[PDB]
Amino acid sequence: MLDVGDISSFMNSDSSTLSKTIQNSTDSGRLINIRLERLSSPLDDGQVIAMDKPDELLLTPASLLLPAQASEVIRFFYKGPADEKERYYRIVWFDQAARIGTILVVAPRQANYHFQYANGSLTNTGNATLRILAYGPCLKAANGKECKENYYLMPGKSRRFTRVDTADNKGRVALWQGDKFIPVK
């Protein structure tokens, strides 16, 4: 396949622009087209919805010839409202030596980051998605000597960790509020 970088990218509230590097690691050059769709949500039961205006989210370049064993920067620009709402977009990449879909999250310009860790459950009690993670011993020793989990936690949703043993005092929880890393436990 083609290397697009992160499968979900985050434009945090102090930022309206973002770059992704794409690498073509094969002998062939490639004809890439790139397209954007807003989404009701980033989840599987989400659906494409309309941008309020066609300059809400723009990228360059939308077409390029990427030669063999070479990389290029694609830039993304947000010009929609600066409000308390988080927005979700799909980046659709067409590849010719494959149609791959990745996620862009525009965190609310008016961010209110909050969370609760109670009874082993993380709950997002703010208005912007959190990137949550645990690391430490495994719950089922069938899974091995070290365990980690990584998830996106949308506003209002909860998550228990199911691989890492967070009840053991060597099990750790932390999360990202935009660009700030917060040691939860």
Care to count the β-strands?
16
Rg measurement, Å: 19 Å
Major sheet, described briefly? 6 strands, mixed
Shape by Cα distribution: globular
- Number of domain modules: 2
Residue fraction in strands = over 45%
Count the DSSP helices: 0
The succession of helices and strands, N to C, reads EEEEEEEEEEEEEEEE
The first-to-last residue Cα distance is 38 Å
Structural class: mainly beta
* Helix content, binned percent: under 10%
Polypeptide structure, described:
- The chain folds into 2 domains: 1-110, no CATH class; 111-185, no CATH class.
- It is 0% helix and 50% strand.
- The protein contains no helices and 16 strands.
- The chain has strands at residues 8-11, 17-24, 30-39, 48-49, 57-60, 63-66, 70-78, 87-96, 99-106, 115-118, 121-124, 130-136, 147-153, 158-160, 172-177, 180-182.
- The strands form 4 sheets. Strands 1, 3, 4, 6, 8 and 9 form a 6-stranded mixed beta sheet that branches. The protein has a 4-stranded antiparallel beta sheet with strand order 13-12-15-16, with no helix packed on it.
Task: Please tag this protein with its features.
four-stranded antiparallel β-sheet; 185 residues
What is the topology?
Layout: E1 8-11, E2 17-24, E3 30-39, E4 48-49, E5 57-60, E6 63-66, E7 70-78, E8 87-96, E9 99-106, E10 115-118, E11 121-124, E12 130-136, E13 147-153, E14 158-160, E15 172-177, E16 180-182
Parallel strand pairs: 1-9
Antiparallel strand pairs: 2-7, 3-4, 3-6, 3-8, 5-7, 8-9, 10-11, 11-14, 12-13, 12-15, 15-16
